[PDB]
Structures are given as structure tokens and as C-alpha cells.
Amino acid sequence: TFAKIKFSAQIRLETGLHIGGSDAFAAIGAIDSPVIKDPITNIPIIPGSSLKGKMRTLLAKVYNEKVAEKPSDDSDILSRLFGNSKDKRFKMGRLIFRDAFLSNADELDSLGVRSYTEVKFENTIDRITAEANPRQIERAIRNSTFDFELIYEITDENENQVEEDFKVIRDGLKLLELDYLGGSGSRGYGKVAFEKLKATTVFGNYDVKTLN
Amino acid sequence: KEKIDLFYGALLHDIGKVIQRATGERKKHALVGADWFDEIADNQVISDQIRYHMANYQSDKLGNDHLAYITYIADNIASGTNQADIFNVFGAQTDKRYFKPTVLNLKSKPNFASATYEPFSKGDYAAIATRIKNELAEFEFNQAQIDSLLNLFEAILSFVPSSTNSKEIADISLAEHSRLTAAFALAIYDYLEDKGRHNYKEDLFTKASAFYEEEAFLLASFDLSGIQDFIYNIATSGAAKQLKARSLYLDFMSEYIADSLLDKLGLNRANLLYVGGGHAYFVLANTEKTVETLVQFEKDFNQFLLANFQTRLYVAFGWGSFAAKDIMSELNSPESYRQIYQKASRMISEKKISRYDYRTLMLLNRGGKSSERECEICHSVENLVSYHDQKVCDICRGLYQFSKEIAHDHFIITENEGLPIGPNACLKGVAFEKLSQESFSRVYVKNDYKAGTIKATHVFVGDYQCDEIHKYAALSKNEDGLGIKRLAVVRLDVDDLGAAFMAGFSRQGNGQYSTLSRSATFSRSMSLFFKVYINQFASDKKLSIIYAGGDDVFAIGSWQDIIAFTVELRQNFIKWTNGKLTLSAGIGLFADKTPISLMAHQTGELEEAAKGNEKDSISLFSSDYTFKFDRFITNVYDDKLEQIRYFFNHQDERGKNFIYKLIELLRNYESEEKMNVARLAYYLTRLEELTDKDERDKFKQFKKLFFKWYTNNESDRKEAELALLLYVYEIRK
Amino acid sequence: YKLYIMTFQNAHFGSGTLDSSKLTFSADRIFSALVLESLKMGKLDAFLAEANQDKFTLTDAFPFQFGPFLPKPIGYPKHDQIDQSVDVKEVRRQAKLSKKLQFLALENVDDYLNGELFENEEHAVIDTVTKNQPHKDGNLYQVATTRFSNDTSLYVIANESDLLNELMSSLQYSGLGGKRSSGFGRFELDIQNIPLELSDRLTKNHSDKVMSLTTALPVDADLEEAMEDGHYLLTKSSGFAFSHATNENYRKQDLYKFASGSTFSKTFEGQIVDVRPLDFPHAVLNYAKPLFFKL
Numbered sequence A: 001t002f003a004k005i006k007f008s009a010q011i012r013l014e015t016g017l018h019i020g021g022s023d024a025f026a027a028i029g030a031i032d033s034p035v036i037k038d039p040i041t042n043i044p045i046i047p048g049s050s051l052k053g054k055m056r057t058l059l060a061k062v063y064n065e066k067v068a069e070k071p072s073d074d075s076d077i078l079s080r081l082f083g084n085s086k087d088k089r090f091k092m093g094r095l096i097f098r099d100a101f102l103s104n105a106d107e108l109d110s111l112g113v114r115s116y117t118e119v120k121f122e123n124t125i126d127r128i129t130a131e132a133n134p135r136q137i138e139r140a141i142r143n144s145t146f147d148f149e150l151i152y153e154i155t156d157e158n159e160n161q162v163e164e165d166f167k168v169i170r171d172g173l174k175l176l177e178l179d180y181l182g183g184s185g186s187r188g189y190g191k192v193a194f195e196k197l198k199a200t201t202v203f204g205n206y207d208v209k210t211l212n
Numbered sequence B: 001k002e003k004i005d006l007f008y009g010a011l012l013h014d015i016g017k018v019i020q021r022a023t024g025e026r027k028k029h030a031l032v033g034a035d036w037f038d039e040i041a042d043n044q045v046i047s048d049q050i051r052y053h054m055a056n057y058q059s060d061k062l063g064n065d066h067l068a069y070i071t072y073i074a075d076n077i078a079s080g081t082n083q084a085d086i087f088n089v090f091g092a093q094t095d096k097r098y099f100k101p102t103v104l105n106l107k108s109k110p111n112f113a114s115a116t117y118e119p120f121s122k123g124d125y126a127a128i129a130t131r132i133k134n135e136l137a138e139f140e141f142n143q144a145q146i147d148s149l150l151n152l153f154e155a156i157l158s159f160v161p162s163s164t165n166s167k168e169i170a171d172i173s174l175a176e177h178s179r180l181t182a183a184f185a186l187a188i189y190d191y192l193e194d195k196g197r198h199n200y201k202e203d204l205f206t207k208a209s210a211f212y213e214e215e216a217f218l219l220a221s222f223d224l225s226g227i228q229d230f231i232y233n234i235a236t237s238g239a240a241k242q243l244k245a246r247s248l249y250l251d252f253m254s255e256y257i258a259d260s261l262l263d264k265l266g267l268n269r270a271n272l273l274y275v276g277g278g279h280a281y282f283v284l285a286n287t288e289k290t291v292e293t294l295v296q297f298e299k300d301f302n303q304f305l306l307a308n309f310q311t312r313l314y315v316a317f318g319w320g321s322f323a324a325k326d327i328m329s330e331l332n333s334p335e336s337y338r339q340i341y342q343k344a345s346r347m348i349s350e351k352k353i354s355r356y357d358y359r360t361l362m363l364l365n366r367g368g369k370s371s372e373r374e375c376e377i378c379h380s381v382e383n384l385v386s387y388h389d390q391k392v393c394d395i396c397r398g399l400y401q402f403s404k405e406i407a408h409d410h411f412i413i414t415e416n417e418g419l420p421i422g423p424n425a426c427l428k429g430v431a432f433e434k435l436s437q438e439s440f441s442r443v444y445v446k447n448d449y450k451a452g453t454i455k456a457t458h459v460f461v462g463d464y465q466c467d468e469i470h471k472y473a474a475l476s477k478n479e480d481g482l483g484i485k486r487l488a489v490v491r492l493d494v495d496d497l498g499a500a501f502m503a504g505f506s507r508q509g510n511g512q513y514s515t516l517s518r519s520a521t522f523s524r525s526m527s528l529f530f531k532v533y534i535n536q537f538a539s540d541k542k543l544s545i546i547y548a549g550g551d552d553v554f555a556i557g558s559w560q561d562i563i564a565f566t567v568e569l570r571q572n573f574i575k576w577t578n579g580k581l582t583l584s585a586g587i588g589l590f591a592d593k594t595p596i597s598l599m600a601h602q603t604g605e606l607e608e609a610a611k612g613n614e615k616d617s618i619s620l621f622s623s624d625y626t627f628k629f630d631r632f633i634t635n636v637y638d639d640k641l642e643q644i645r646y647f648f649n650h651q652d653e654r655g656k657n658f659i660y661k662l663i664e665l666l667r668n669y670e671s672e673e674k675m676n677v678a679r680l681a682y683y684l685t686r687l688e689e690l691t692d693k694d695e696r697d698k699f700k701q702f703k704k705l706f707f708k709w710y711t712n713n714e715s716d717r718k719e720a721e722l723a724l725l726l727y728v729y730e731i732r733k
Numbered sequence C: 001y002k003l004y005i006m007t008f009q010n011a012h013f014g015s016g017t018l019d020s021s022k023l024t025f026s027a028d029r030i031f032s033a034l035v036l037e038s039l040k041m042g043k044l045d046a047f048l049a050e051a052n053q054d055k056f057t058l059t060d061a062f063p064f065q066f067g068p069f070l071p072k073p074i075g076y077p078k079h080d081q082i083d084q085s086v087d088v089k090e091v092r093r094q095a096k097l098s099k100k101l102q103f104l105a106l107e108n109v110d111d112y113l114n115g116e117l118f119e120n121e122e123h124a125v126i127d128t129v130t131k132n133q134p135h136k137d138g139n140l141y142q143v144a145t146t147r148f149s150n151d152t153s154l155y156v157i158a159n160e161s162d163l164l165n166e167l168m169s170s171l172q173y174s175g176l177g178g179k180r181s182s183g184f185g186r187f188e189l190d191i192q193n194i195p196l197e198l199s200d201r202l203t204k205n206h207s208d209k210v211m212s213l214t215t216a217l218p219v220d221a222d223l224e225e226a227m228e229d230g231h232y233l234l235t236k237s238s239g240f241a242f243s244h245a246t247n248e249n250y251r252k253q254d255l256y257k258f259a260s261g262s263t264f265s266k267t268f269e270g271q272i273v274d275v276r277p278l279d280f281p282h283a284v285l286n287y288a289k290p291l292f293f294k295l
């Protein structure tokens, strides 16, 4: 009738990415947009808006039936999983995300590393001169786990389509690993890896069997 | 007609002092002033009051109930060797400064007080009495004109004192003494008429503390709330162009309260003590007639503001009776003078929390609207109209038309032509044509030079616009390739305000230092610097000042000139106050195309965060750079930030690969203390080895100065983070 | 009666505009959330007959840092306590510190009325994040977040029953206020039994200089009778409605209530106002059930 399906997993970054944060106050040792961190401490974190804005775009191009143009108005078979401000059949999003915090600090200081974010030197070639615009970026370190929990809940009517919903979510998790997740990922910066993909219940109203 | 003669009789009561100080003649100022005024003007009642100003004259009485008998009591209220400094009698005894009677003009440079003039007296000047006699040819003073002379009397005589004698009475200028003495004269006429008797206007106050002990005055004040919540707070970023018109909307609203209240009761402009920023101090009388007027006025002024506006804008009055014996003669205790303001400011905090009452609060909770169309500017749905991409309502609709009306020199107050600001009044922007011109016109920064037959009751307010608002991103970057496409916002606000107004002038038991005139000249001396001198100092810059008041300002624009204006404006304030009043602010950059709500709110949180230490602190780009401001222009901006501009500019591209790492070392100091010191010795050798051999002669002292600034003081370590950050933002991209 | 301790981490609670945010939120946010999720479970008609039972009430979000916190009394103290009279500048500069204060400690509820002024403890800092959209003319927007620190938690006091504990069990895994479609609302419910022996002065009968909280709202039969000689502060709380059968979502009418910590004199009643602009198949409910503290 009403269950709470939580998809607890650990995001393992096999390649350092780069996501532009807010202003430059926590990392002013760069020339472009730095990576957002924590305003209290000093741990590189990733917001939850980047997980929904990227997974929905890469998923609405294979499970669609019409050429899209504007958000919240393409492929009704998957619009009920994110959100829609036009259809009356559904409004709320049944896939609550969470800001993935870096929980790898419990064993990172024992090995002795540099810090938390490195600086990479990049430039461009105008095919008429040598080095042009000596800029630089700020990527993330390698091997850093995170806490990603996907909340799923039914609303009574969710009855004769629960088994079909797991096919889209499971296919969307493995599809994100084969694509970059960040900025300027065309050269190979993103590419995540969902480690220990498991699902459990909190309220207790639906048995677990479709674990993998 | 009968009561208006008393107002003009107290303004020119010392008109003969200017001629005496300019032309050598052994005559009194009260005797030569009546003869010089009668030569060009054909009057008689106002001429007898000039001769009967003092008490040792009596030209054969001539008059039983004449109005020339109450001018001596009101003269001692506003009263108590070139020109004594106002800020000199505040705090301790420092340096003795003196002004200079020049010409007050917006384009002219300010004459700061110093100790290099003539400590003797004035001399033989002719640049003051010449302009007075030139425009003296005016028709009979009637009701058609009110502020046709007060706007010029205080625009040239602002640097001329009144009655040069001793030291207690010398810091009061003649332009303010003659203006303040007319307010107390009108209260006596209203007190002697509301009661019943009339033969008292002669000679019955034999006792020194007779009329001075009886309470016959009233101190009125208000607190217009909703200034920072209506101007700074905004919805979308499309209201950036009309933000200057939004600031001028509430600026004339506070001036309309002073005009509608004094004209309805039957007074003039003398009953005014600095109106601006939602704070003023009105003077009245202790009569039952003046009380019934302010009660009905506050109930009707808040009536029309409930339909168009909401609960943001609210005006709460505050009265407080007092006596005239609290600012003269006996009673030298500081609590005696402070009790006058406590009788009116106490109800201010009580009336603002007790706004509406019965049969008023339930009107807003009725409900009758059912539509989904808002202006997305101020969150209000009331009489909308089409415009551009959105549908503007009616509250923020008049700001678009008024934004283009800023270039107009005159502001005609109409009835229903545009956007109404009062009960049955309005305001528009047009000039050089005069399509109607109802009554009471207002202009902006109109001093001397430009003066003719205008006749307008105006005030002073800052107004300066560079090039729009939403385009300072391109002006911050030069043509070569330096700077960023961002902008900064500073909010310079005065720190201490309870002193130099309540009880702070006490230093000697001789002088009382509690006269209302001594406390009234403090607001007038600082209003010329925070509301008039701002437009002159912001010239030739890539910024535009907005809301130039005596409290908090709002300067927006490119940071290429704001940084050079914030630290420079405080330097002119220290010399004007002899270093007795501190100042604090905060400069913070933001992004382009951002909502002004959080853009003006995040820069305001740094103001409160810059007061945790004591009072003379500062907050830079973030809340971590907590310094003392004085250590910036004398150390950081002096021999730190400037030294890098000519001792490191020769190294480019390859040489600019070490500043980004040295900043990170300055932060990691608590967990890495001694280990970080050993790593600093390695970065100082990588820059010297990776350069030209002939260029090494320039890099010879920066290594020792940078290492000493790291192990000396905890507060000194944060100074290097600010110098290395301003250098990267200079030349980049 | 029974407090529900819960801590927040990177949340969002706007007040007036979406870009702005505050550290706390009004009491109408909690009441308008449990009713909206009751229809998704299958017991919307069960909670409707429970909120209108007088004894059932809710409290505002009060901070909890090694002890429960309470709002400051509006208008208190009066003009009688000066707190170390030294100079007019030192007394005037410290009076504003109490005005900017948000909440007082549970042990300072009696010492503040006798003469004590201090700066409020730094609970958290206001931090903002930025977002945009690449495939829509490159537009962008700015929103603010609330990142608590130094063990900053909240708590709400309600009534113990066998139905309320199950409705709030799913709220911790469903968001609460702000951007719900991102993860700005997830928390953890820390259940407890014994509240505190000092915070048991919640009464609704006698009137001995009480203090209304959770945005009071007098009834039409008792408005000016309890408004005269009191201390309050009008606020603002509105916004677009959220329904599933309107195709327009009409704007809810304004309800200018009060603030948390207003001191009146008598005891109110507390009603439930219905917000119906044009027409709706349901009814927009509202809390408006202020409590009282003996002080």
C-alpha cells in the first residue's frame, strides 16, 4: 500500500571530474569556476541537482516516443519518475535524491595524501600561434566514496506497474557509468561506478527480492 | 497673513552682522540691519521687530501687544575666533580647527577644517554680502512663496557663525541659528492663542525661570519602516534598471510627511530637523490643538497605504513634551537632556509592534482574488497591465516611467497624474515646459550658481548614474585584457550614532554642552558629506551611487572604482571629524544576472559580522578577513599590494604559476604549523631559479619580506591572502 | 507533552521568495505537509477528524543544541532594566543585540526578565548554491540553503497517539520544505519519551501573562478583547497552491498572522481557516493553533 524503497550504494569515482560550484572563496587558487565544497568544513561535496539533471536527460533519449523540446513535456511513461508541472495525474517526484557527501575521510588521512582538490594545467591551440590563454582547472582526487540514496515510494495506484519501474531505474544506473558526470567530460573526466548496489526497506511494507 | 510675518521677522534678525563684519562701521548688528532692510523694502511691522530684538533699547515702547516682544525669549533658546569646529567640542581635547567662509557649491571642492587659517577673526570679505544684495530685490513676502529664501540663505551663509563671543557660542552657524530660532517663535504664537490670554506679550516674566519652567513645546518623531525590505528585496533580476527610481520613490515619501503635516497645522520649514532615511525630529507646542492634528494625520496616512501596499510600509509617530529649562541655565546633568528624547523614542518601539487594530486586520483576510498573473517583481497582484515579457502590476509600474524622468530637473507634484504617493497627491517628472505646475515643487542638488525665478520647496539628495545598471560587466574589463566581467556592492554605514547627539559633548563643568543647537548642528554638518559630497566624490568613476542618505548607502557598479572609492571616502571623513568617529563597511563581489534580493542581503551580513571584535573593524570579500580597516591603506594598500604591481609585473605566463599555491599554504596553518614553515623555504627558491639571469636584480628583497610576513603575527598572516587575491583579479584572462 | 527531536542538514526554507531562505520556518509548513501526504497513504479522512480535537496541536521549529531553546519575549523587558549603567553609548549599542536575537536557552527564560543581555549563539551560516540550464538560452537562478553546524538540531512538540507516529515516520524520507525534488528536506526522527521537567508550562486555561507562539490567529468572537495592551509583530506567509486537479493552481489568499513569541494577556481559542479562492474539490487547511507558556 505504502512502502519506502531506499537504494543505498557507494559512488566510486574512477576518474577525477570537475563541477563548477558557486563563487570563489573556498578555493581561490584557480582561474575558472572552482568545485563547490562545504561552507562549514572543507570537504569537496557534490549537489543533488547534478544527479537528476543528468540522469533524466540521458534516459529520455531511449525510452521516448517523440522528439523533445522542453522539459516536463516528453515521454509520459517516464515523466512520473521526475516531475511534471502540466499533467494532473502526477506532480510530485517519487525519486528523492540526496547530496552525496565524501565519507572516504575515515581512511584517507592514514595514507597521507596532498589535500582534497588538485590543479591541472590546460590551454588551447589556435593553429596560428603557440600557447594561447594559459588557463587552469581544479579537478577532484581519485578513489573517493560517496553516500547516494535513492528513495522510492508507492501511492496506492502504483500497483500494476511496480515491476516495470525497476527496469527503468536499474537500466539508468548502469547507463550513467558509461558516460561522464561533470563539466568538460568529453575528454574523460566523469565516468562513475556504483559500488555495492543494494536496496532495503525502512517502513516495511514490501518484500525484497529484486535486489539484482 | 498676520501669522506669517513672525516667520520672516526671526530669519533676518541678524542681517546686519554680515554688513558689520564686511564694512567698517561702529554700529550694532540689530540697529544697522533694520535700516538696510527698510531702504529697499517698504515695510513697517517686520522692521520694528529687528530693532526690538534685545532688551536694552526700548524706543519709547511703541506697542502694547506687539509681536516684537516674544522674539527675545525664542532667541535665547537657539543660542544658550573665526568659526569653532563642531566636532571639536566632542570627546577629548585634540587639535583646534577653524573653517573658512567660502561659497557652498556642489562643483566646488570642500573646505576641510584645519589649523592654518586666521585665529584672530574674519577680516574684510566681499564675496558674501554681494550675492545677498543682488537677489535682495524681491517682492512682498506673502504666502505665495515659502522656501524661496531659505534655500539660498543656507547655501552661502553655512560657513558664517552667529555672535562671535567666548567659545560656548561660536560653533553655531548663522544659517542654522536664524533658521532654528524661527521654529521656537512659532510655538509661542500657537501657545498664547490656544489658551486664552493675550496681554502676556509685553513684560511679565520678571523671574528668570518663569516661562522657561512651564512646558510649552513638543518633540515629534517617526520611524518609517520598510526601507531595506522594499528596495533591496526583489524577485527577478529585471528590476535592476528601475532600482534607482525605486530609491527615489521612498525618498520623496519621507519629505511629503514633513510637508503635509506642517502645512496643515499652520507652520513653515523652520519646524524641521533633518528629514531623511525614515528618521526626523519635529518640534511643536504643548497645546491641545496640535495633539489632535497628529492623531488624525496618522490615521489617514496609513489608510490609503493599506490598499495599494501591504504590511511592509508603516509609519509610527512619537510625541514627547519637554521644558525650555533643560537646554539652558541650570540642569547640567546628562540625564536631563536625554529624558526629552526618551519621552518620544520609547513609544516608537511600542507603536511599531502595535500597528493595526479592530475592523482593519480582518479586511486583508477576507479574500476576493482568483487569478494567476503577477509582475514577478514585488509579489503583488493589484490592477495589472501589459508591458513586455511579463505583466507588470501597478505598484512597480510607475517606476518604469519614472526611470526615464530622472533627467528632468524639476519634479511637479500633481493630484492624479501618474502614481500617487499621498492621500490626494501624486508625483511625476517633467521640466522646461511647465504643463500645469500645481504647488510645492522639488528638485535635486540645487545649490548656488544656477538660481532664478523657480520658487520650489526642495531639499538635498544624492543622484548620480553612470551607464545603466545591467552592463557594468563590460566596463570592469579593459581593452587590453585585464579584469573580470563581475561587479561588487558596498554598503558604507555610519557606526556610532548615540554619541554626539545625546550626551557626548561634556568635557568641562563650565559649559553645559547640552543646548539643542549644539546637538542640531551635528546632523547638519554630516548631511553635507553623506548626501551632497557623495555625488562630487563619485565623479569620473565607473559606478553609480544609489540611496545617498545620512545612514546607509548603496553603491553598485564595477569594482575597478568602488575599491578606490570606499577607502578614499573614509579618508575625507577623518579629516572632517579630526579622527573622532569610526567608520565601517564591506566590499563583496557577485556574479552577473543575479537576483538583487540575496545580492544586497549577503553584503549586509558582512556588516554585522564586522563588529564582533569591537567597533573599528572591516569585512573584506568574506567573513574571515576581519581586520581594522586602518591597517589596509597604511600597510596592505600602501607597501604590500602596490609593491607587487612593479616587482612582479615583469614575470608573466611562466612566472604566474606560484601565487595559486602560496595562498593555500597561508590557510593550512592550524593542523600544519611547523611543517608548513619548512615547505615555505622551497617555493621561495623555485621562482628565483626559473627566470632570466639579468632579471634576478629585481627579485632581491621580495623573498625576505614574504618570509617575515608569515612568522610574526596571526593577524599579519591574513594580510598576505588579501594582497595575493587582488593581484590575480587585476590582470587575468 | 512529547517532543520529536530532528536535525537538518543542507535544507531549504524560503520566506517570501524562492531565492531567499531563513534558518527556521513557520508552523504552517508542518501542518500543510502531513495532510498532503495523508492522501497518498490512504487515511486522509482519518487525520481530518483528529486535528480538530482541541488537544491536538503542533509547535514551531525550535533549535536544540544540548538543550531546548525558546523564542525571546516580544516587548520584554520594559523600560526599567538598564544592565550596568556606564554610558549612553554602551547601553544603546547592546540593546540592538537582543533585537537581533532569535531564540533563548531553556535556563535563561527567567534570568532574561530580570536584567541580562547577551549575543545569540552562532547556530549556522547562510550558504547559497547556483544552478542553470544549458538547453534553455543559458538561463540560471540562485537559491539559498541552510547548513547546520555545531550540533544544531530541531524539535517539535505534539501529542502522543497511535496514528501520528506513523505519519511522521515517512516524512524523514520524503523531504520537508524547499526544493523537495533534490534532497533538501531529508532528516532523521529521534523519538523520545520524557521531555524535560522545566518545559511543562504549556497551558490553555488560565491567563497569567501568557505568550502565544506558532503564529497566533484570534477568532472573530475574540479579537480586540485580547489585542489591547499586547506585544506582537505581523509577518507574511503565502504562495501558490499545490493541487492535482486544477490545471492552473490558484494563488492562496494572504494570511498575515503573528510571530513566534508574542505576548498578549488573555487566552485565545484557535480555529482552522479554509483558503478557497475560486473553487477546489478539496479544502486548503491551515494550522492556526497557538499555544501558551507560563513564563
Ligand SMILES: Nc1ncnc2c1ncn2[C@@H]1O[C@H](COP(=O)(O)OP(=O)(O)OP(=O)(O)O)[C@@H](O)[C@H]1O
Binding pocket: B274, B277, B279, B495, B496, B497, B523, B526, B527, B549, B550, B551, C092, C093, C096
Ligand atoms: N544622518 C543622520 N543624522 C542624524 N541622526 C541620524 C542620522 N542617521 C542615523 N541617525 C540616528 O541613528 C539612529 C539609529 O541608529 P542605529 O540603531 O541604526 O545605530 P546602531 O546600528 O545601533 O549602531 P551600532 O551598529 O554602532 O550599534 C536613529 O534614531 C537616527 O536618529
